[PDB]
Structure 1
């Protein structure tokens, strides 16, 4: 009964060689990870990051200089779960322990482990005194002390954590080895044979839960024998235990009666979410599935919902089956444990490094004529509309704010509407804008109702929260909106509530919340039946009241005059699209969006300040606008009224225009550009 199997996997010399690689590494002053371990011993960091490349670099290094190394990349790659603690107990062999005197305000966790380090040694110092005092080289005298005393386990006092990291193909491109762990694989590609492996998946973060502590081990005070009982739980649920389980309360008539304790237990950060399929490699008639991923420890609070992320980890089952009668006997429900996060579309306001950044940013700066180059680069796949692209470049900036303090804020947001139909292909840009921009949700007219894009209340799974909508999702980002003309009339009311910032009021059956939203609005509606009748007026061919048009600072019109000379360049434009896969030729090179947004995000941290001469230039220029707008008062081609919100925008615009100079140099040509985009945006209906 119960036979045994030998396998080529060893645990002995692998533990020996993994000690040497943990010690002997010099390439990337002294040893790399010991200085990191001294930084861990500095008690200022909680994570340990292990690559696979320096392993493979070492594995290249040992064969070329010495006889033979045991393979260790594919060794970890197979089972990958026993390599957690068998690696980590070798770390505690070597440690620069007293490297800094403890701070009084360091950590309440730190003062507890310092006790259990010291209480271990003082208990160790007692037993070696009694044995030498009762005699009848001292290694066996040391060894007698080792087994006659109950101690705290070394698993109980750790204070740090370790996360693995998958290898890139880049070093695998030089020397091909077991690079199977890092491929963009699908949930459909997850066959049930990849259990225990280390994988790489990607998708969309959907229905993120909340972070709440997970109990791991529980302390138990005796109060009679004075020991501490410890119970490790790896199940879903558990039980409290009996009255005592001491060795000294044992073999005695009166046992104790215990109770647990809070401050001595060890907890863990816990939160999970679900990943939906990428919706690009899905077969032609299928519906995307989901997958459960547990997240533990340091990496928590790092995954916003509705993103694109590369998740790598190791693939483990959970003991669970479905309904009671449907159980075929051994039903294994799986999950994935998160190990490393690499996000596509790297989020702004999260970097501070500038040196390797300005290694490429200064080359963009020293390229010359940058501001005209930018709007050429965002969605260049149409012809013309450069001033139209120029304003949308400025929509990408935004990024200004001011509160007077004990008062009100001002919203530094731009709201550009688009009018015209149909051969301008506006939706080619509408998909392009929310694609490059981080936190970009593409929305339609009817597919969200008045309750859809706002929040909702449903029963919480395992961890009655407010499940939010798209505008709840796409805060601090830009919402792309199709066909505002066909919304619900109640859905119009919420949009007016965004033009005053952060306001979403709810007076439903049990909900009285006023939730906040740092969103941004782009809208595009179509004109009336027919197309551009000069017999029709402004607001005659418009299906919306002008109070909503007063809330729009910037408005465009998409004319289509069939002109003879404008076609031949546009004909050569569109035919060149299908000849190749790139439009510009010998005059321009496009900016890739990843390098583009980093220059944007660095420009988002400037906050230019105005001056006094630019104060003088704007005031009389507003008297220019206020005087000639109020001399018509008609339903003619000119619009009716000029708001003070027009001045609120154009001050904010030249402020945002100063941000692309990155210099806090609000000047005369700063404002000179701002007036040009006002008079051309309006009244382009002359031809």
Structure 2
């Protein structure tokens, strides 16, 4: 049959020591009785076990010559067995409820009480304990400092890569690191399956821990055990016990991949109260049990010894960063007080965005004005106005406009970078099209990537084909995308600011009529944009000397040099942009006459647009609307709930500087 071997492990002493630790442990009295008391009162829903406590308790009790072995080593060597040992120990030592219970809501206990009042009245079945259980058991990996406290090498942790996990780590508790990519939905999982017996005594129960399940045919009821059939047993949904189930996969980081290789993946199962504690697209430190999975589910009758493997989550450290939606705290309140004391801020903010790129102060000022946004939240009688600003940047190759765009995307949490094709699922199609394994055809229809309150950044604006051009023309002036293919009309409400960089097809500015260079795009699309910048490269000594000196000093220090002088920090801008957006100044009427006469002078310029050679000074009401929006944004960036004539003057100066680059 099966030969037997001898191992130094025996579970009797392990269970006795586990019980002694659970009862006697002092960290309020004992902590492990406080958790059990809260569980008894139906307050706590899950139990977390710290291995550091076990280690230090054993170490401090070793001073007396009674302890003989260690438990954490066996925990690391095998984990699943100790789970049922711990649940048995908890079930044996569950104190009574010290608090009142709303007993009528527990329909499971009510049904069980009805069954007991049926059976025990006659003078009954011993139900499995897990059906009665309500809590969840979780483990926590130890900390390195606790290991450093003592001589022993009780380390664990050590977040190995996906490919560093070998076949000798099955059954152990290991910690991994990587980026989460795919997260499935939440679906119930069966733990104990109950059948009703058609009013024939006790109702048979069954528990299946496998990933497959088979039903019963006949039942042990006495009148059903009688030589003729009495009712067909049926599964009962109410009496059964279920559990939340979720699955996800994790990928290796690009830093840990050896050269000339393709990153590998890993499947993770999660159950219990920890479900939905992680989201796609974050760096995590997951600790769990590395378990094998049978191949028989595929049913191929091949790979006689080859098996699939997966990790069952036990503890997740979300890590990464937190946006927090600028939730107000005392420290950030003193931070904004410091900003108030700082005086004028926007010039320092412009100086502090991209010090690696030299000069171009006005472009950075326009970026600041883009970040805050213009006038929004509609007007009377339902007319639509958007706070989003659309700015297109023109310049020759090699002006670090792409690097500036990357810096803006870094500093803006809503920024997204796209380009003409290269990746197909970024425009006119949903990211979940044909995605599920069932091929359920999940789709919204006509939508873009996070176009709701997003900052879309595009390089090579002339490159995109007709489809992406149609999409960018459709997202004009907060207009929703209503492209339909199969009766779907779930339109994405696009309210986004468009920032794009492009170049003429010649690759260099031309002495001829500047509109002949334009964008090589339709003039209707050009007129939509709020602000147009042209960055023309003029060879000169007194500026290229500074640029070369800056670049070489950056290269020499291998860092951002101290030659930069910025009192404000990128996280500080991240805080202050939300703070100033929250303030939200509104419009003051006293500037109406001034803006009207400014528009009159703008049309006076339109009376000289036929003078040519910089004919961009054309007549458009969107110019006035953008002037209003830019003045509103100038009020919003620093000022309180008031719009100043100085904002109108600054917007006018910005427009004149925008036009002045034509020459």
Give the TM-score of the pair, scaled to structure 2: 0.80
Provide, for residues 189-216 of structure 1, a one-character-per-residue CA deviation record: whole Å limited to 9, x for no partner: 2223222333333444434433333333
Structure-2 change in CA distance of 1:371 and 1:290 (3 Å): same
Structure-2 change in CA distance of 1:488 and 1:459 (3 Å): closer
Structure-2 change in CA distance of 1:654 and 1:267 (3 Å): farther
State the Cα distance separating 1:120 from its structure 2 match: 11
State the Cα distance separating 1:328 from its structure 2 match: 3.7
State the Cα distance separating 1:298 from its structure 2 match: 3.5
Q: Answer yes or no: is the 8 Å Cα contact 2:161–2:177 preserved in 1.
A: yes
State the Cα distance separating 1:541 from its structure 2 match: 3.4
Q: Answer yes or no: is the 8 Å Cα contact 1:274–1:293 preserved in 2.
A: yes
Structure-2 change in CA distance of 1:450 and 1:4 (3 Å): closer
State the Cα distance separating 1:333 from its structure 2 match: 0.7
- Is 1:242 paired with 2:217? yes
Structure-2 change in CA distance of 1:11 and 1:119 (3 Å): farther
State the Cα distance separating 1:462 from its structure 2 match: 4.6
Structure-2 change in CA distance of 1:333 and 1:422 (3 Å): same
Q: Answer yes or no: is the 8 Å Cα contact 2:52–2:142 preserved in 1.
A: yes
Q: Answer yes or no: is the 8 Å Cα contact 1:320–1:332 preserved in 2.
A: yes
Q: Answer yes or no: is the 8 Å Cα contact 2:387–2:629 preserved in 1.
A: yes
Q: Answer yes or no: is the 8 Å Cα contact 1:313–1:339 preserved in 2.
A: yes
State the Cα distance separating 1:320 from its structure 2 match: 1.1
Q: Answer yes or no: is the 8 Å Cα contact 1:274–1:291 preserved in 2.
A: yes
> Which segment drifts farther, 665-674 or 263-272?
665-674
Q: Answer yes or no: is the 8 Å Cα contact 1:378–1:393 preserved in 2.
A: no
Structure-2 change in CA distance of 1:91 and 1:472 (3 Å): farther
Provide, for residues 209-232 of structure 1, a one-character-per-residue CA deviation record: whole Å limited to 9, x for no partner: 333333333221122224232222
Provide, for residues 497-534 of structure 1, a one-character-per-residue CA deviation record: whole Å limited to 9, x for no partner: 22354733333367555345666543211123042224
Aligned residues: 660
Provide, for residues 146-188 of structure 1, a one-character-per-residue CA deviation record: whole Å limited to 9, x for no partner: xxx5233331244443444445656667778757544443322
Provide, for residues 540-581 of structure 1, a one-character-per-residue CA deviation record: whole Å limited to 9, x for no partner: 332112322233223332222223222333222211222223
> Which segment drifts farther, 522-531 or 500-509?
500-509
Structure-2 change in CA distance of 1:588 and 1:237 (3 Å): same
Give the TM-score of the pair, scaled to structure 1: 0.77
Structure-2 change in CA distance of 1:113 and 1:46 (3 Å): farther
Q: Answer yes or no: is the 8 Å Cα contact 1:116–1:152 preserved in 2.
A: no
> Which segment drifts farther, 436-445 or 563-572?
436-445
1:669 is aligned to 646
State the Cα distance separating 1:299 from its structure 2 match: 3.8
Structure-2 change in CA distance of 1:113 and 1:199 (3 Å): farther
Please state whether the residue corresponding to 1:391 is helix, strand or coil: helix
Provide, for residues 454-477 of structure 1, a one-character-per-residue CA deviation record: whole Å limited to 9, x for no partner: 227865655633399994467654
Superposition CA RMSD, Å: 4.8
In the alignment, structure 1 segments of 5+ residues that lack a partner are: 124-148
Structure-2 change in CA distance of 1:324 and 1:485 (3 Å): same
Q: 1-side partners of 2:600 and 2:371: how far apart?
A: 29
Structure-2 change in CA distance of 1:80 and 1:484 (3 Å): farther
Q: Answer yes or no: is the 8 Å Cα contact 1:484–1:523 preserved in 2.
A: yes
Q: Answer yes or no: is the 8 Å Cα contact 2:374–2:630 preserved in 1.
A: no
1:156 is aligned to 131
- Is 1:107 paired with 2:103? no
Provide, for residues 336-384 of structure 1, a one-character-per-residue CA deviation record: whole Å limited to 9, x for no partner: 2334444455353568473566687777776776544444443433222
Please state whether the residue corresponding to 1:322 is helix, strand or coil: coil
Q: 2-side partners of 1:197 and 1:411: how far apart?
A: 56
Please state whether the residue corresponding to 1:476 is helix, strand or coil: strand
Q: Answer yes or no: is the 8 Å Cα contact 1:413–1:520 preserved in 2.
A: yes
Q: Answer yes or no: is the 8 Å Cα contact 1:421–1:526 preserved in 2.
A: yes
Q: Answer yes or no: is the 8 Å Cα contact 2:346–2:368 preserved in 1.
A: no
> Which segment drifts farther, 258-267 or 596-605?
596-605
Q: 2-side partners of 1:74 and 1:234: how far apart?
A: 27
Q: Answer yes or no: is the 8 Å Cα contact 1:400–1:607 preserved in 2.
A: no
Q: Answer yes or no: is the 8 Å Cα contact 2:446–2:481 preserved in 1.
A: no
Q: 2-side partners of 1:547 and 1:352: how far apart?
A: 42
Structure-2 change in CA distance of 1:320 and 1:479 (3 Å): farther
Q: 2-side partners of 1:71 and 1:399: how far apart?
A: 66
